[PDB]
């Protein structure tokens with residue numbers, strides 16, 4: 001318990017939080033000199049800013065946001081100043097853009113969001129970035145919305161449940177508690193996001209891939225949902241030593257069975273081979289060593 005590691009995540013009812021919490025517990029149980037804890041946050045942007053500032057040693061973040069940060073481009077949060085202090089540890093699972101709408105709000109498509117009260121994501125979230133890009137693909141801006149609300153997942157579904165919001169965006173792994181919870185109490189529907197419309201701007205944002213949310217994933221949503229997704233990644237500060245990261249990797253990913261128990265998305269989508277597939281930023285030296293020894297690299 002000599003070296004402290006705080007892992008930035010997201011809303012407590014998202015997927016980043018339980019994954020980070022599980023990862024922290026697993027590394028702590030390994031007794032390798034690391035004392036880890038997860039911290040709820042606004043998401044990808046907030047997490048990357050925290051790692052750069054030296055506040056967090058690790059964090060979960062979307063591959064697209066990590067790329068923009070490392071390159072100092074593409075989104076207002078990082079344009080003009082690259083964040084070269086972040087390194088990738090592993091690609092984890094697909095993060096799907098969920099566009100949730102109350103059935104009584106007159107919303108069947110993204111275009112219908114015009115004049116509506118929409119939760120666009122949390123402050124410092126990756127979700128907000130995707131929402132802004134997707135809305136533009138449909139000819140809209142936050143100003144065209146009735147209200148552009150930035151709150152946590154728990155606050156967001158509360159607004160939806162009390163009818164103070166009409167729709168909500170959430171770039172998150174399938175099965176997020178926040179969405180499951182909302183589906184059980186409120187009549188909701190998932191709005192589609194056309195990949196082709198997105199493809200029209202794929203040159204600016206190349207990380208989107210087509211993704212179908214299986215019918216029955218959430219209560220009351222029995223039809224499949226055609227949308228888009230990016231990739232969740234575990235990242236770390238370049239400042240962490242190779243030895244520390246290497247020990248961490250063996251304690252967390254070295255125990256694959258234990259790791260997959262952390263969340264259904266890991267059991268369903270995680271694999272060491274895919275963990276190093278199409279990474280947007282450089283792997284941390286400690287992770288490279290782990291993957292080389294595992295035969296993955």
Ligand SMILES: N[C@@H](CCC(=O)O)C(=O)O
Nearest residue numbers: 010014015016043044126
């Ligand atoms: N990818 C989302 C967070 C999703 C989650 O918390 O599971 C974001 O960066 O805003």
